[PDB]
Symmetry: C6
Subunit: 66 residues, 6 copies
């Protein structure tokens, strides 16, 4: 958890565009507005709450330094 | 946790129409009637119980908070 | 808990229900009993369904809500 | 109601050696009889004796009606 | 793990070749090198790490006794 | 556990790997870091992978097992 939090928090603070792929193959895009232990609030063309358990990978639009 | 609860509770109180997408791709629509640690009660024709573990995303029909 | 009182109402009232699995399959019958991890579904034949494999429980008619 | 239902149910199928079908979340249908089980897996006997993870199981359907204790 | 540990440990010790079916339908084959609470190390050309949560069934190539 | 030392070796030794997701997709790269729930993979694209979405981790060459 010592890696996930800083990573998501940095993406959030720096408003880094991200692509979030779900386990079912669907791709969501936007910026991370906030998150907690179980969900990620993604804002963009469509604001939405995403459950982490349904996420396979988070691919930042550019590398992030922690 | 700190975000999911306030978020769901807001959608509930404001009776905001939502779209709930399941991990299998199916889309449910209705209003959040109530929820607990493991389920969400989605109201429509009849209120159905959705297990959170089966949910991918919750998309509000309008801006909240 | 909201799940327990809800399932108990469906059980007590013997309400016909549809149980959708996470893989899209639809089961029909009535809730005979349940515990923390499974539900006993009675229909043409009885069967034990793991809750981790359930997506939604849809009653055939409105029922008292917890 | 932790395992108040699951344990007595699986144990009945086990002791009575009831033929059963176990459907997995991916759609596969396994057949045989429950040899034993613990909190996470089920040992299913058929052509061979295999270990099934409960997390991959959707439903357990007895070949015939069963009476719980 | 009253059954899981003894079972996997026997397969490991007897070096019994096994078929591991994943929840996505892919079939892996090899010998169990080791395992812990979350993963199993499956040896073949190279030893790959398999997450238990992705496993549906473990099928021994030949009968084993517990 | 086995997972940690195993992943740490692949990391410390910059071993190229293939991570197969529970949905079949194959990711390739080198493990940059990881914690209890995610693995940061890097190669052509950098990305955070949730362990719950991973089925197997396959090294490009044999490595010292834990």
């Amino acid at each position: 958890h010592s890696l996930q939090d800083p990573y998501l928090n940095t993406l959030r603070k720096e408003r880094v565009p991200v692509s979030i792929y779900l386990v079912n193959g669907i791709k969501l895009q936007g910026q991370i507005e906030s998150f907690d232990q179980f969900v990620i609030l993604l804002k963009n063309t469509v604001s939405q709450m995403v459950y982490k358990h349904a996420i396979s990978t988070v691919v930042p639009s550019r590398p992030v330094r922690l």
